[PDB]
Design a protein around this ligand. Sequence first.
Ligand SMILES: Cc1nn(C)c(COc2ccc(N3CCN(S(=O)(=O)N(C)C)CC3)cc2)c1-c1cccc2c(CCCOc3cccc4ccccc34)c(C(=O)O)n(CCN3CCOCC3)c12
Ligand SMILES: OC[C@H]1O[C@H](O[C@H]2[C@H](O)[C@@H](O)[C@@H](O)O[C@@H]2CO)[C@H](O)[C@@H](O)[C@@H]1O
Length: 514
Amino acid sequence: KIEEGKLVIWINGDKGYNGLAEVGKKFEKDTGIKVTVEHPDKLEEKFPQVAATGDGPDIIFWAHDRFGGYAQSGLLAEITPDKAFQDKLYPFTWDAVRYNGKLIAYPIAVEALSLIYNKDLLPNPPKTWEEIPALDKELKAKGKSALMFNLQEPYFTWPLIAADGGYAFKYKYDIKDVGVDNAGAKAGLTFLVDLIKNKHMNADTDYSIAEAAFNKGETAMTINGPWAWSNIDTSAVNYGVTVLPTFKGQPSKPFVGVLSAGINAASPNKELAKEFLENYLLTDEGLEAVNKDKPLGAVALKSYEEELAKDPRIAATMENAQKGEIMPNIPQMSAFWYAVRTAVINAASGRQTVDEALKDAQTGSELYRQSLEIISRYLREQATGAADTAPMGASGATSRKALETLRRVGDGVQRNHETAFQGMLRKLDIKNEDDVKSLSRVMIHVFSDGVTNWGRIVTLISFGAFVAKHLKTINQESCIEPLAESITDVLVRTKRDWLVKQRGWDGFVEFFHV
Ligand SMILES: Cc1nn(C)c(COc2ccc(N3CCN(S(=O)(=O)N(C)C)CC3)cc2)c1-c1cccc2c(CCCOc3cccc4ccccc34)c(C(=O)O)n(CCN3CCOCC3)c12
Ligand SMILES: OC[C@H]1O[C@H](O[C@H]2[C@H](O)[C@@H](O)[C@@H](O)O[C@@H]2CO)[C@H](O)[C@@H](O)[C@@H]1O
């Protein structure tokens, strides 16, 4: 689907895409290859949809956190720079784009949020979040406000939420330990909600409203990344970039992202893209060209980062980074972000309490792991005749009773529907681990085209167990876990919002309670 003999690049609209296009034209002047740069809306959600069908751009730019999901889905080509090139980037930025032992992207720049403040209104920025209400009272009396920043994207509210103990996935990362609804997360999000309640902030403020308020001098402070500096420069505001305020004595902890460039697994121009990224973009002149459009942050290229680091705005960026944490790149990051976005917005607007909002977000971030735990154990004990002796772990009461419930209602379905199950199991003939990958197509077609309820979910998992028994008999026991993962992916992404609304697997257990 992708045209050969050229390069299409996607990058987000807040980045220096005009600068990126300039590097493209220099590539063109050398090779005769045209370089088109686009910045479509919601490109991080469009990429996986289009690239799954073999379409999309040759190169996609985004912070590294999304790339684990893309690599897991087979959407990114493995990148293979020689040691001479790898030595030119900071080791830690390469780590950010390593997934299951392979490099899946070229790292570009390190991004962290800072506090940006107007030196003509606040010559001394607050060191604590706690003192911002009184400062706002002080500024309101002068016709100004203390602080405005984007409240629609959780990226910007997360520093406050993690400050007192909130976190995504514990530590390696234990995908089973989610820290979205613990006391620390609550304490931070409560402080944000209280700021809104006391008229210090507006739940409706987004990126554009906050940017224009600061850049016109109506608000004294904003929270943003290095890409926003260019527009402040133009407004001629006298701004400083500094450490984020502490909360309850501890630092704000922003999720640090590494802007990175991935090559589409279906692109016919992988040698061209490697040549552009390694020998044109990731060079002193290439990054400067982008940086002059919208600042990149602390770039991954050592030769150039040595000059930018001297800029206090970059030193402040890297100080805020060292207090924060590099984002995971695991595939569940997207699900985490979707959940926390909904929770921050509902809590800020009043649709839910902080308790409600974060509980749902906790159930959403845990949905995939918990579903896989249940579905995999059921499939394997059904196929082998023996249960898994391993502890259930986090939320283990739910999983244990979900599985017990499933044993009850699932075994009755395999018996009563043995005729339909046998027939479906022949139309599909499963003999290979590869065939199991072909299932998702028909599996989704059937599961999607109807109503939603726990009974069809039981059918879904029960045929899964029916198919697992067969795989075991033909010595294909290795295919049962990839089968459990495919069932779980189909279930969680097609019924995410319904399942969260049912209180997840607690609803399951309650719905089929005797
Ligand atoms: C084809 C086909 N003909 N018939 C007759 C069936 C069974 O029919 C059933 C109808 C109802 C129920 N129950 C609901 C109420 N309760 S309960 O709540 O009261 N309780 C006590 C718990 C439990 C019992 C069970 C089975 C099938 C049939 C086969 C394989 C799988 C299903 C699925 C699950 C989705 C498909 O998954 C896979 C598809 C392909 C490979 C797969 C590998 C793994 C896993 C899943 C796979 C569905 C479904 O989406 O439902 N269906 C049926 C879809 N039909 C519906 C009727 O019209 C036409 C379509 C299936
Ligand atoms: O808010 C969730 C969002 O946060 C991060 O996205 C950042 C991005 O990293 C920055 O470069 C800049 O564009 O702002 C974005 C926030 O609006 C994550 O990278 C992204 O996956 C996540 O959804």
